[PDB]
Structure formats: C-alpha cells, structure tokens
Write a protein that binds this ligand. Structure first.
Ligand SMILES: [Ca+2]
Ligand SMILES: [Ca+2]
Ligand SMILES: [Ca+2]
Length: 121
C-alpha cells in the first residue's frame, strides 16, 4: 500500500512517486518535496523562487525586500524580514545575529533556544 520502489520519499513522511519532483506541485504539506532533499539538484517552483539554476536553492519570495530575490548564496536577504544581519553571522530564529560559535551547539544562546530548533543532522 505504498508508492513504487523508484518512488521519491518526502520530508513530511509523505510519499510522492518520482513524477512530483520540483515542479511547482505543493504535494508535500511542508513544501519541501522540491527542496534540496528531493530536488537535490534544482529549485522549487511557485511559493518559492529560484536563486541558482546551477545549484539547489529555493526560498519563499517573501525575502524580496528590494522587489527581487537575490539569495544565490543567501547573501542579499538572509533573515531580511526580522532584522537584516550579515550572512557571515548566525541567523537567529528571530532574525538576530550572533557569532557562528553559538550555532546550535546543543545549548540555547541567541534568544531562548530556537537557535537549535530542530538543529539535528
Ligand atoms: Ca511537487
Ligand atoms: Ca531580495
Ligand atoms: Ca547553540
């Protein structure tokens, strides 16, 4: 009662045969059927724009603070909503920036703990 062997597994535990690849199809409740996990070579489509036709990078257009997404390497708008930090800093769940040394080291630090919100492998 499961997809065919060559099927592609989705990140939300959902199952989608190889034909629902990054193709603009919201089939995964978490929108990540078109992310680097399944579309590990291309970017999502609609509800997420293209930052690199040469790599796997799709993000939600909401970071177009200048009317464009320029995040080729997440440099122009990383955490552009909350606070604009410098891409060379550790993006906080609230947008804040701290030293990359506080990157989820299994210990809270930036605000409360979100700094490690599901920071597992
Ligand atoms: Ca899809
Ligand atoms: Ca932008
Ligand atoms: Ca930490």
């Amino acid at each position: 009662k499961t997809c065919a062997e060559s099927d592609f597994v989705c990140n939300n535990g959902q199952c989608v045969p190889s034909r629902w690849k990054c193709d603009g199809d919201p089939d995964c409740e978490d929108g990540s059927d078109e992310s680097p996990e399944q579309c590990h070579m291309r970017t999502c489509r609609i509800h997420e724009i293209s930052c690199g036709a040469h790599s796997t990078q799709c993000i939600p257009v909401s970071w177009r603070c200048d009317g464009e997404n320029d995040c080729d390497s997440g440099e122009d708008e990383e955490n552009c909503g909350n606070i604009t930090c410098s891409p060379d800093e550790f993006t906080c769940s609230s947008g804040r920036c701290i030293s990359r040394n506080f990157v989820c080291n299994g210990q809270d630090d930036c605000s409360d703990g979100s700094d490690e919100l599901d920071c597992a492998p």
